[PDB]
Nucleic acid binder design. Sequence first.
DNA 1: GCAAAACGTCGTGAGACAGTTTCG
DNA 2: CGAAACTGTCTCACGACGTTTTGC
Lengths: 155, 153
Amino acid sequence: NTKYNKEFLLYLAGFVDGNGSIIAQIKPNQSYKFKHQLSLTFQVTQKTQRRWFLDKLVDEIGVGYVRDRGSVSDYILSEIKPLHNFLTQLQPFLKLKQKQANLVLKIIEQLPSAKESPDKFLEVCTWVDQIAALNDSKTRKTTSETVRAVLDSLS
Amino acid sequence: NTKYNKEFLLYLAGFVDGNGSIIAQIKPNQSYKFKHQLSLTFQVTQKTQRRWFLDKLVDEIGVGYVRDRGSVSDYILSEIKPLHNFLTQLQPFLKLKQKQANLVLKIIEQLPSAKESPDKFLEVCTWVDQIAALNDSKTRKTTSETVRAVLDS
DNA sequence: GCAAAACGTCGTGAGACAGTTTCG
DNA sequence: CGAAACTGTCTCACGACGTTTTGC
Ligand SMILES: [Ca+2]
Ligand SMILES: [Ca+2]
Ligand code: NA
Ligand code: NA
Ligand code: NA
Ligand code: NA
């Protein structure tokens, strides 16, 4: 696990509080046992003329990548271990997104047990609902209730 | 002048780089010698649900105020002396808005001189043009050329 | 089956001005 | 006069999702 410098973490926490997204999703996908994938993403978006800054984040954080979507680009970090390590170090300095960060860390820690039982999987999905509620969510479709119905129509 | 803690400045520089605006404007106004006001503003906007963070900035920076404009609110710092003191301490940690911050400091230092000569006023107006070019400017109207035309006439 | 990447999109939450007014 | 406040709104630069594909 990479140990990050404190001044970098302080700066990045301010950047993330004002212009970062800590996202948790439940993605319908038939290849999974409970028919959904639990997905977590740390994202930093910038107008494409500033993509260089996002490329530099890839070098500084040491993981992740950047994708382009036209007028803007996004730094994306979704690998679970690196994400846990990064958010663990960043969270003490967050003022606006600390609760989302901690809920993501909680989810990551319970992923192994969530795979073992439908009731635990559903509980972890309610934590995803909690993150969405803290975020400025506007176009969400798959929720813990979507999952509850599927699990019931399976058992 | 207030001396700020480095940890606060590091955090706020990150916040400003991603969600801050360093604004310079030339405002047509007949009560001024050169018929325009040179205006500088440091602004931090948030959805109103998070205006509490802006209210805390007023206490932490120690000057400025919050205004509400519907769905969002803005922390506003326009007083020149406190603005110069604040940006002087914040700029070493800025990575995306350092150029705008330093141009604002330069403008502030030259305000006294800009009021004694048309050419000097215009020179400072060109530094305002530079800040707007660095920003994601989209609805700007009054530029150094606007002023140049007014003064010539 | 699951991690992770790849690709795609609705509706802002800001960003950056503009115009007008106050009062030491 | 002139610094600073008061007030308004256009146009994004994101924010937070969504769906599909890759491959061990
Ligand atoms: Ca923001
Ligand atoms: Ca931004
Ligand atoms: Na919300
Ligand atoms: Na620009
Ligand atoms: Na006054
Ligand atoms: Na893989």
